[PDB]
């Protein structure tokens, strides 16, 4: 199937409290595999996945040096933006970037990413044509003009179509099967109620990976999406995820409801109902 290599970058100023905090986090198929955190005595790029430990010392050295270079460049960008926005030197500000490539099964780029945000709002982004830019405001228009003159889009298309795809292949060779990892959910239904003629049935999905999952409740073939309560998928903290969906039903009709669990690790969707313990 398709794969992706993307870096999530963060630069946060802290006037009076020290140098800006800079971070570079790499993801292969939405899984963190490397991280650089400037908040240290001697900051270094590090593996976040055991399979990256294969890379030799020269790799880590080049990545570390490039990261510190990026950090210092962003330090300047933070100042530049205070200027573009006519802002004070005393407030904290954040610059964020999502930069990467998602390639198809045939090894060709499906989509390139080079998008920026300032204080949580879109700043500028490279368009799908990998040739033009979309500035979100007046400030971004200055960067746009500057990048157009420098041929920045061409520079990024090169990286996105070449360098990024090539590195993704390399990383996949060392952690392909690992990324293919799949933990199917284990489900069960709990019964809850406060002295009333109604009861809550909560369908739980535990220990699954990846996070993508769907839970539904059915009353005789029909999905109850109107009054079904559910929580956002959440990390158990051990690499797997959790999620639940609940519905309020009439006391005594618990057996008329069925929960369905859809996950990529399941040979077939799970089907279950409330089971009063023996």
């Amino acid at each position: 199937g398709p794969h992706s290599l993307r870096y999530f970058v963060t630069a946060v100023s802290r006037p009076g409290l020290g140098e800006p905090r800079y971070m570079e986090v790499g993801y292969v198929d939405d899984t963190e595999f490397v991280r650089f955190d400037s908040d240290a005595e001697n900051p270094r790029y590090e593996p976040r996945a055991r399979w990256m430990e294969q890379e030799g010392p020269e790799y880590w050295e080049r990545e570390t040096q490039k990261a510190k270079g990026n950090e210092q460049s962003f330090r300047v960008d933070l100042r530049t933006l205070l200027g573009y926005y006519n802002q004070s030197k005393g407030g904290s500000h954040t610059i964020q970037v999502i930069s990467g490539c998602e390639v198809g099964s045939d090894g060709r780029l499906l989509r390139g990413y080079q998008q920026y945000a300032y204080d949580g709002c879109d700043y500028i982004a490279l368009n799908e044509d990998l040739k033009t830019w979309t500035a979100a405001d007046m400030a971004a228009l200055i960067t746009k003009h500057k990048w157009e003159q420098a041929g920045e889009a061409e520079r990024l298309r090169a990286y996105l179509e070449g360098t990024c795809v090539e590195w993704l292949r390399r990383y996949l060779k060392n952690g392909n099967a690992t990324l293919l990892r799949t933990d199917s959910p284990k489900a069960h239904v709990t019964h809850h109620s406060r002295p009333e003629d109604k009861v809550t049935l909560r369908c739980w999905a535990l220990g699954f990976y990846p996070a993508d999952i769907t839970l539904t409740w059915q009353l005789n073939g029909e999905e109850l999406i109107q009054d079904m309560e559910l929580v956002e998928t959440r990390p158990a903290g051990d690499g797997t995820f959790q999620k639940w969906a609940s519905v309020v039903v009439p006391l005594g009709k618990e057996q008329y409801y069925t929960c369905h669990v859809y996950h990529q690790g399941l040979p077939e969707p799970l089907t279950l109902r409330w089971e009063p313990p023996p």
């Binding site: 460049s73 920026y116 500057k146 520079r155 990286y159 360098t163 990024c164 590195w167």
Partner: peptide, 8 residues
């Protein structure tokens, strides 16, 4: 490997 970022 991440790209070397340009100035804003």
């Amino acid at each position: 490997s991440s790209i070397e970022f340009a100035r804003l």
